[model samples]
Target: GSSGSSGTPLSLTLDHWSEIRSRAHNLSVEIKKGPWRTFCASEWPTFDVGWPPEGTFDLTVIFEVKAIVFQDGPGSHPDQQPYITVWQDLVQNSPPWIKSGPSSG
Candidate 1:
């Protein structure tokens, strides 16, 4: 019920690494079920901004994905990094994940 309707398995890249100090945003990927859900609760450590606060970021790029996964339930939870699971719900169900559109979900 919650594990269904997830987007494609992510193809994550290191992109770049940073150690700057700044306010840290939970760098993450999200999964959603159907057109009602669209958020990624999967938080992954992407990069750290150095020469900045623990949360200060000069630039950030977020992309939305649309993949089809088998249904698990109404509140599906996708795997993070395929290495870890952050919670029982998709990050899309969580706040701060922001929804770009429903096409992906």
Candidate 2:
């Protein structure tokens, strides 16, 4: 199995689009060089990591999903692009995760 980042912040700020894109691109390249290259090539799955369990008091991790887009593909039904909007709190942590609670959104 492959080990991942050790709480490394993808960017200094969360809303930084350039930072987000850079991280995504780097991840894509890295995945392509791994055993799951083929699968990772066609699938771009993004998710929130280090999410704290529900009802947790400590805001240790802050991860949020801004949007999720699904495009039409082989064996797919919807011909048009469909997506979901979260625009809300995701996860909570420290440093790279988030700076504070609630307002982190």
Candidate 3:
């Protein structure tokens, strides 16, 4: 959420990982089950100023991701529901891993 320290106090955190996952799951579900019938979720890791330094970066170091989404497109058909999933290792600095499925109980 929020982090601070000496110098510029610029940093990052993972406090919203669950919320981010929930939101992503919901939107994908909407598309996967609706008219568009296409859903996808991609996750990749990156580093920034936070709890783990990589070099010149100070204050702190952390890992984050880039969320790529493929919404309704020209090739989209109204009759297909594409599944969404994330595959990755369980190590630190790796992207999140999620199974493909509907976003509700």
How accurate locally, in lDDT, is each candidate? 0.23, 0.26, 0.24
What is the clash tally of candidate 2? 9
| Over 4 Å off, model 2 | 1-14, 29-97, 100-105
How much is the lDDT of residue 29 in candidate 2? 23
Q: Write candidate 2's Cα lDDT for 1-105 as tens digits.
A: 324433322222233434333443544422112312221123222233333222111223221212122323453312111111111122222333434235554
Query: Which candidate ranks first by lDDT, i.e. highest?
Result: 2
Q: Rank the candidates by lDDT, best first.
A: 2, 3, 1
lDDT tens digits, residues 13-83, model 3?
12234433444465463222222111111111111212223111221111122112222475332322222
Q: lDDT value for candidate 2?
A: 0.26
Off by over 4 Å in 1: 1-12, 17-66, 69-77, 81-105
Model 3: lDDT to the true structure: 0.24
Q: What lDDT score goes with residue 38 in model 3?
A: 16
What does each candidate score in C-alpha RMSD?
17.2, 14.9, 15.5
Q: lDDT (0-100) at residue 95 of candidate 3?
A: 22
